[PDB]
Design a protein around this ligand. Structure first.
Ligand SMILES: CC(=O)N[C@H]1[C@H]([C@H](O)[C@H](O)CO)O[C@@](O[C@@H]2[C@@H](O)[C@H](O)O[C@H](CO)[C@@H]2O)(C(=O)O)C[C@@H]1O
Ligand SMILES: CC(=O)N[C@H]1[C@H]([C@H](O)[C@H](O)CO)O[C@@](O[C@@H]2[C@@H](O)[C@H](O)O[C@H](CO)[C@@H]2O)(C(=O)O)C[C@@H]1O
Ligand code: SIA
Ligand code: MG
Ligand code: MG
Ligand code: MG
Ligand code: MG
Ligand code: MG
Lengths: 257, 257, 249, 257, 250
């Protein structure tokens, strides 16, 4: 009847896994104008995503009856919020002219989004500057045209790979995702204090208007997120994205479809 | 029950399918109220569309009249993901050191949408009545001192896309019996933008009598403005940045008295 | 069950039908409490109106619910009209727009709003045009039960001298929010979908004495800062829709 | 029901019926913790009153007695209107230009109130234990370093108006079984004050068991502190400003075992 | 029903009962990640206690609800005690008071709080007094399922190195809020009227194994800034009220 799965998604802020700056981007470089804009690889965050294999049910061959895992609810937590109490690790100081005070810690933009679905997250391509040339490592629509600075119904994608779809080029497509629930919050600024909450007591119902949760096609549960907590500012004023990992607990029930 | 999905692209000032689509031109500021003539492209206008619904009645004088009734909607600001871009030609956090991220989009948020069975009914109201609007804009000319506050003579309806200045027109609470409108303004120029998005939020459009907007001429009228803040260049020139809005409207065929 | 719709224009200080309607005159600041004399037009006053209801008067019109909206929020997207620039040294950027304190209050009642006199500085000399308690004394800086008024005139009771009296107003509902500061971003919402019930703990709405519906408000949105750094209050008008029913009293 | 209405004037430091009633004296700041001595009038104290309720004439020897039960209250901060004053001898926004409004009251908000059937029970706790409070103030003298956090030995009761320093005493959560208290602190020195007022908000005072405060000796105990922020003079001297608080308490006669 | 009331004092770094109890030592900042070594007393640690409940034996104590309050919020109205002044150039104005980051977390359970190790900089060398995973590797900058602990001691698990483990804690409820920055206005509320239900989705509260009730918290209120601009963590104590019932388990 009921199964719980638990999973994590580590952030993909830009710096490679299992090296000293895992969880961070490379230092951000800023172009002089829109026509000379080519953000280098490692300097911008990408979406995290994973497909969790569920116990065989939809692909069970003992019945012609179609059964699917239905995600009825979830808990999700940003993990490692504790680490942001660190104001000693090589941070620009509050009173930098006097070489005094705490580090300024992680400050600036928060972008927190997650999606839970029975198929890959469907994406709309949309960029601040269409003339940005994304690097070879990134999955983007090349030469997308001026229409990609707002909504263009031709510019679609699917979140099919971890750590390569730039956050700044792709977002959830509200014209699709009938079998996914997604949630996002953006708080801008470069000196904004991060605001994060964590608890193991908060449940999100995933049922739609008709009382139906995401249905897991091919016995796959699709988890996606981005958790930009803000910027790390070094003594030399170089700034990098810092990300945190996301916990998922999804409650599923066997459903006759 | 029929569901329609639609988008409204922002009309921040720069023309469609040119390099600054989604932005205004750089804002110039007048020395005084007497010599205040904002050039075309430097200010945002409302977005609006009439969606053609399936044609119902052969004749509007009939003993039984069918109309499409909007009973609920979902709406999302799209492209919030793009505001994670702090590399595209933005004034830097530490401009004196030529270092840090771009400051990103900051400042005023103006977010409003309306769903109705006829054009949005507007009240004309301006900061400075002596402002001279350009030929491209729809405004009340020589509105007089009274137009700085409420004057019951200064009415209009949102009959055209991309030409009614946001700073000159607002929703008329004396009218709009057949439209639901919702707005939030956060002011300032360095204010952090706060935006949320989800495919899970439904707004019921039924009034206190249990009646939704009724679509006159089988037209569904969608209106919005989504100013997310200002883009600041290295040379400190500032432009409005806007985002497109998604609408999902659930309609039922209703017999109407 | 009849519906009334009304507007109250703001009374920020500058005269009606002239170029600065909706604004105060530029704010001057005293050197000390003793010499403090805010000139007429440099401070906002309460807006009020009595709406005449259909003759009834035993029966009385009972206000059961209302909608209220701050109108013209749209105009605050104007950052071009003679405003101090974001980068004033560089002579560049948008205007800073309207910023600073927000004071939003409305009242709906069956008689004039009952007021408590209370001032920041008791030694302030208000102008002849303003309705105040003259020489109110030091007790007027906090609560003094002797210092009462009623909001009987539009555009003359200073906001900074009079507030709603919680010891009275048994036949009025009032609601207020203050956000201070001089650089604070204004935050305003508008919708035609929000209804406030005016029934009290016993299921009785304001009862309209003499078939009068009394509307009051103040809507300070913030300050307008000119290039020369002179600052004025900016206000917005308020919409009221009040649903009344005939009640046997 | 029986309704009681009362006010508590603030006790910010400056004496009643003199020109600075509602204000503290200008705040001085110690060079170090060891020599810290906040002078009388430079810091706020709690306001408190006992209201005599109608006598119930009860045999305190018998099995059944009547007590006044506080079932609900309305409370309002009064005089919020006065904070629209930016002309009264305030540091100007553009002090270098001798131009702009006064900066008005800004900085810390501390709003607390208590309603009980006996005096408010206090826990002594201070920022700096080596502070020497003046003779006029009720404190625990030489409290020791444990007074900077929780020390179960350091108790008090709020038995006098205007002499218990807000900065040395708070509500004791280990007691106060017969009192309801509510507090909010917003810190900073340039923080915008945020206050609401309405005659339409009721707070229920019944506990988990459906019992409100029971008025011992037919006495209703009201306590508050309402620091709205600081007044800053042209010469940058800063003082606390407080506002008075209104109480409306609904009481019923209760049969008590 | 039985009620427990208890307090936990903060562990901001300075030793108990000395003049700076409730504060950290002044925070020093490394030049780089490789040489990063936060000295003992300059960082906050978790507070924890085990409450020994009355012997029952089978029955177990079940925590069904709680109230919790941050105590001493009143003290933050102090702007006179050796604080950097608002107008330091004029040597005038109040103290700036406590400003900056708020980290508020509490946990109530029937066994020790289960922890996930996670650090800003894996190359930080923690002092001997602290309980950490030594040389934890680059993976410890994000989630590594190998890097686990349990909150077994008061005032030694660094806040910046351990957080509640969402993959465990089936028998504990935990709640946290972080507001960052260094000049942020602190926002704190207190009341004796707010109850939190501790029952899970099946109507079962934490069950107290070996009749032990486990309380854990951290309450960083912000930074104290001296005239000389040296900055220290300031913390506040937390009150717990836990409502318990006897439950037949076997
Ligand atoms: C709120 C207030 O008291 N405003 C004063 C105003 C200010 O005090 C002044 O602008 C600050 O420098 O001053 C006013 O004019 C004053 C004259 O009446 C007086 O004779 O001379 C004063 C200078 O010594 C000052 O010019 C004003 O600007 O209107 C009076 C107003 O009440
Ligand atoms: C909070 C506190 O300890 N306040 C002191 C105050 C401050 O220490 C002082 O303002 C910081 O400069 O000092 C007070 O007494 C002063 C003497 O300490 C000083 O030597 O002489 C001053 C007169 O020039 C002054 O009298 C004060 O300012 O009142 C005493 C207070 O407790
Ligand atoms: C977090 C950290 O690594 N702090 C180290 C600091 C800082 O590097 C310097 O104070 C910056 O100049 O230097 C020490 O000599 C010190 O002052 O005790 C050793 C300490 O371990
Ligand atoms: Mg099958
Ligand atoms: Mg669709
Ligand atoms: Mg109407
Ligand atoms: Mg107790
Ligand atoms: Mg588990």
């Amino acid at each position: 009847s009921i199964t719980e799965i638990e999973a994590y998604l580590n952030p993909r802020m830009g710096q490679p896994q299992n090296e000293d700056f895992y969880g961070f981007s490379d230092n951000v470089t800023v172009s002089d104008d829109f026509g000379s804009d080519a953000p280098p690889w490692k300097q911008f965050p990408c979406y995290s995503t994973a497909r969790i294999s569920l116990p065989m049910l939809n692909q069970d061959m003992t019945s012609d009856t179609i059964l699917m895992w239905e995600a009825i609810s979830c808990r999700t937590e940003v993990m490692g919020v504790n680490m942001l109490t660190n104001v000693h690790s090589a941070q620009k100081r509050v009173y930098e002219n006097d070489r005094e005070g705490t580090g300024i810690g992680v400050e600036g933009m928060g972008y927190h989004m997650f999606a839970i679905g029975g198929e890959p997250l469907e994406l709309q391509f949309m960029v601040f500057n269409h003339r940005a040339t994304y690097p070879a490592e990134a999955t983007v629509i090349k030469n997308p045209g001026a229409s990609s600075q707002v909504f263009d119904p031709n510019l679609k994608g699917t979140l099919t790979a971890d750590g390569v779809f730039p956050v700044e080029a792709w977002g959830p497509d509200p014209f699709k995702n009938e079998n996914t629930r997604y949630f996002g919050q953006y708080t801008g600024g470069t000196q904004t204090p991060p605001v994060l909450t964590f608890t193991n007591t908060q449940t999100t119902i995933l049922l739609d208007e008709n009382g139906v949760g995401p249905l897991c096609k091919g016995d796959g549960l699709f988890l996606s997120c981005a958790d930009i907590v803000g910027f790390f500012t070094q003594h030399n004023k170089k700034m990098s994205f810092r990300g945190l990992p996301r916990y998922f607990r999804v409650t599923l029930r066997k459903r006759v479809v």
